[PDB]
Amino acid sequence: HSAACSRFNSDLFYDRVKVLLVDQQGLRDAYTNILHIPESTQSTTVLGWRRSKNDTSIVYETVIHDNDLNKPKTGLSEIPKEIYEDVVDEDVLRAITEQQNFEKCNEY
Amino acid sequence: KTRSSRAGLQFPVGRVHRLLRKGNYAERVGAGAPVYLAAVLEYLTAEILELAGNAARDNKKTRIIPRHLQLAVRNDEELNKLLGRVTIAQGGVLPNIQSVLL
Amino acid sequence: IPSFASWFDISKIHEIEKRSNPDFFNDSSRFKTPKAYKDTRNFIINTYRLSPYEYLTITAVRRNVAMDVASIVKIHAFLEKWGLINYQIDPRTKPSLIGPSFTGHFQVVLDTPQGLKPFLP
Amino acid sequence: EQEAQKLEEKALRFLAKQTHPVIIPSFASWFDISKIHEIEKRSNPDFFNDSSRFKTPKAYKDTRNFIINTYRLSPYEYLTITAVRRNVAMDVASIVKIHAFLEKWGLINYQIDPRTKPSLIGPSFTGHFQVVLDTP
Amino acid sequence: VLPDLQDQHHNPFNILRYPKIRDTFINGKVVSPYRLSGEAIMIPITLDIEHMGHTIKDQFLWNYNDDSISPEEFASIYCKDLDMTSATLQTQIANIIKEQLKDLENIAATEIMSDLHVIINLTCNLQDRFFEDNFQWNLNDKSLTPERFATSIVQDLGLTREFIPLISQSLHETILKIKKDWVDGHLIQDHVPNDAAFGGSNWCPRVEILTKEEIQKREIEKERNLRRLKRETDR
Amino acid sequence: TKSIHYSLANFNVFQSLPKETARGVDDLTRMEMALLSGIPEEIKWSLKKYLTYSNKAPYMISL
Numbered sequence: 001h002s003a004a005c006s007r008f009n010s011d012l013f014y015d016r017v018k019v020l021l022v023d024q025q026g027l028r029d030a031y032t033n034i035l036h037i038p039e040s041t042q043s044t045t046v047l048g049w050r051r052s053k054n055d056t057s058i059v060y061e062t063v064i065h066d067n068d069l070n071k072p073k074t075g076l077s078e079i080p081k082e083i084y085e086d087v088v089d090e091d092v093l094r095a096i097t098e099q100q101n102f103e104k105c106n107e108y
Numbered sequence: 109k110t111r112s113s114r115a116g117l118q119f120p121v122g123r124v125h126r127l128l129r130k131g132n133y134a135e136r137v138g139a140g141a142p143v144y145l146a147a148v149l150e151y152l153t154a155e156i157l158e159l160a161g162n163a164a165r166d167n168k169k170t171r172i173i174p175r176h177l178q179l180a181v182r183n184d185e186e187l188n189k190l191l192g193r194v195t196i197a198q199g200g201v202l203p204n205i206q207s208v209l210l
Numbered sequence: 211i212p213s214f215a216s217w218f219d220i221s222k223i224h225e226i227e228k229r230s231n232p233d234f235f236n237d238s239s240r241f242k243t244p245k246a247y248k249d250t251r252n253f254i255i256n257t258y259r260l261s262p263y264e265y266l267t268i269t270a271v272r273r274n275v276a277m278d279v280a281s282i283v284k285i286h287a288f289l290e291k292w293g294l295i296n297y298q299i300d301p302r303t304k305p306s307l308i309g310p311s312f313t314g315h316f317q318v319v320l321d322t323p324q325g326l327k328p329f330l331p
Numbered sequence: 332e333q334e335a336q337k338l339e340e341k342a343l344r345f346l347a348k349q350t351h352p353v354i355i356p357s358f359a360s361w362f363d364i365s366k367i368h369e370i371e372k373r374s375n376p377d378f379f380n381d382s383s384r385f386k387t388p389k390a391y392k393d394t395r396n397f398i399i400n401t402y403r404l405s406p407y408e409y410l411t412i413t414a415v416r417r418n419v420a421m422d423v424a425s426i427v428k429i430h431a432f433l434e435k436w437g438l439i440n441y442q443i444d445p446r447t448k449p450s451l452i453g454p455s456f457t458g459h460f461q462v463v464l465d466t467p
Numbered sequence: 468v469l470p471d472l473q474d475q476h477h478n479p480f481n482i483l484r485y486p487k488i489r490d491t492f493i494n495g496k497v498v499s500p501y502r503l504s505g506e507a508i509m510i511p512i513t514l515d516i517e518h519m520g521h522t523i524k525d526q527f528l529w530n531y532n533d534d535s536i537s538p539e540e541f542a543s544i545y546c547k548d549l550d551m552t553s554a555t556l557q558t559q560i561a562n563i564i565k566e567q568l569k570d571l572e573n574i575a576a577t578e579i580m581s582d583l584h585v586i587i588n589l590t591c592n593l594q595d596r597f598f599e600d601n602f603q604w605n606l607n608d609k610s611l612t613p614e615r616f617a618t619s620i621v622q623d624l625g626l627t628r629e630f631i632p633l634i635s636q637s638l639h640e641t642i643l644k645i646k647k648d649w650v651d652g653h654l655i656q657d658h659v660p661n662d663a664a665f666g667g668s669n670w671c672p673r674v675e676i677l678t679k680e681e682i683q684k685r686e687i688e689k690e691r692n693l694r695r696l697k698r699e700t701d702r
Numbered sequence: 703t704k705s706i707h708y709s710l711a712n713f714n715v716f717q718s719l720p721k722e723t724a725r726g727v728d729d730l731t732r733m734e735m736a737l738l739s740g741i742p743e744e745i746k747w748s749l750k751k752y753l754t755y756s757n758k759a760p761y762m763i764s765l
């Protein structure tokens with residue numbers, strides 16, 4: 001039955017966090033002295049620098065920028081204007097271009 | 109019309125059925141027992157012949173000899189377990205020198 | 211629950227998904243047919259509707275659908291690009307490839323033929 | 332709110348801490364872990380122009396950002412290509428090609444000791460610097 | 468265990484507190500930096516060399532359709548990396564990865580043009596937590612490369628990165644086998660593992676689990692199965 | 703002074719083993735590599751040192 005499908009999709013998640021979050025945060029590379037950490041946690045796509053005025057000290061800090069946390073990332077970047085713009089009602093079409101422009105504006 | 113062609117085998121179904129009948133193993137013999145026995149026999153024969161041919165080709169020989177049969181039956185652990193109590197004439201023993209004697 | 215692209219329905223097939231993978235409606239292959247495509251799509255949905263808080267992986271649905279993975283991944287990457295199944299998610303559940311720790315926030319220095327220099331834009 | 336503080340805590344939790352400096356030869360300053368410069372496209376790697384289906388710009392970033400990340404976390408050690416080939420599923424020709432390319436511009440395995448080069452102040456004066464990163 | 472996510476102060480000396488970092492410092496080595504299209508088809512290359520007191524075993528795919536390194540330079544860097552450089556070892560490597568190519572160069576996935584479906588049942592082993600799995604794979608498809616399927620498998624399960632270049636290669640070898648009998652009697656019968664009417668109590672056949680306990684007997688078992696299976700086609 | 707705790711720059715495997723030319727790219731390769739990079743203000747230095755080696759040692763950068 002299909003109910004057992006999620007029964008495998010649920011526990012397979014618990015095994016992942018089992019082998020990756022109870023040890024020293026991740027598995028040693030065993031070929032290089034690198035601690036392999038699942039990539040969903042660290043970062044991706046540095047967006048640049050922001051410099052402000054300050055007389056000898058120099059400060060370096062890491063900040064995380066975002067526009068909307070409760071509107072999750074999705075596709076629509078791999079959707080061209082030929083496939084969907086042909087014939088759709090303008091209501092969801094506006095919701096599409098809204099999500100898409102948000103997807104593009106999130107990266108400056 | 110021979111039953112071997114109907115069953116799809118190369119072994120004689122009629123001869124196997126006759127041997128089962130006149131062997132006094134029972135008083136009656138079904139129709140699926142001869143074809144089943146012929147299937148098992150032809151499978152075993154094909155496996156042994158394939159192993160012997162591979163052994164002969166490894167020894168660049170195009171004719172199977174008892175030595176090749178011995179090598180093929182002793183290399184495969186399954187047939188070795190099956191025919192462990194059976195000796196083969198002109199087959200010798202496989203070369204195996206102990207580490208303490210080398 | 212989708213907030214955009216509300217054209218989807220489990221009853222019929224829309225034209226937007228036909229243009230996505232045309233190899234499902236023009237091929238006379240024995241294994242691929244629009245009837246099986248609609249069946250597997252309705253299965254992916256009915257199996258995600260049981261708990262809309264986890265990430266539906268490809269092997270999970272692969273466990274019990276008789277369809278080539280080459281098309282399973284094709285339609286699965288289609289139901290994530292829209293408001294479809296993967297739109298309400300918790301942080302922990304993710305494919306989350308096991309790579310090395312990220313770099314880019316490290317302080318890199320340059321080697322000018324006149325001496326070391328900090329890398330500041 | 333409280334979830335913003337929990338997010339910052341969990342972010343710094345799973346974050347690499349810099350313990351060794353990294354040195355670029357100052358003629359290869361152009362790059363980040365998200366952009367592919369024109370030099371990388373016109374050089375020997377030709378994953379672009381869709382010459383095949385096995386190599387793609389996605390696999391190019393998925394391998395370059397693996398090599399740079401493996402090197403910059405332990406710059407004291409030397410990057411051997413046998414470990415890289417043991418970790419990536421790309422064909423050998425491309426792995427060695429991209430490795431020789433990265434070593435050519437001195438991005439990885441740059442032979443340097445900081446005891447023979449004195450410090451200096453760059454044209455950019457002291458300020459207040461930040462690095463913006465996407466939410467994980 | 469490793470100073471990657473832990474916090475060390477400005478002084479790098481703290482890294483010495485870990486054993487797996489001082490290990491690469493007490494008995495390390497100093498090395499010198501080495502000095503070095505069209506349709507791409509992938510050809511895996513397996514090699515099990517037993518020359519020195521230690522033996523080497525690994526697999527890798529070559530894609531000989533391009534020419535940027537030769538089978539001699541690859542061994543020249545594969546032995547320099549392992550620091551077991553020997554003229555006899557480089558020649559031994561160039562004497563094995565060339566026959567694999569010449570033997571497999573004649574088979575390419577081009578001009579197939581046949582919608583073929585096969586139940587791929589493969590088995591991988593990395594001398595720890597080996598596994599086996601069988602699924603439905605459709606030939607004549609270019610969207611899903613075995614590398615992407617391998618990345619999906621390593622992502623869904625809790626597998627280390629070193630399993631990506633292990634399941635993909637062993638999969639390519641199977642593809643070559645599926646293409647081998649294609650040069651002859653390779654008619655594709657409707658071979659299914661499950662269905663509903665046209666072309667499920669449980670997924671006992673469809674298994675991707677990992678097993679630590681070694682069932683190190685498949686080599687003979689597969690050959691036993693393969694030999695009989697090949698004779699089944701003729702009838 | 704010379705101690706592991708003071709600084710980790712010579713533990714047991716690199717205090718006289720590194721070659722004498724391990725301080726970066728050589729002054730010629732540096733010129734050749736900083737000449738095809740697209741950054742300005744850098745070409746203005748490579749083409750200054752090539753211009754120097756064309757009047758003080760031309761036999762070194764001959765075509």
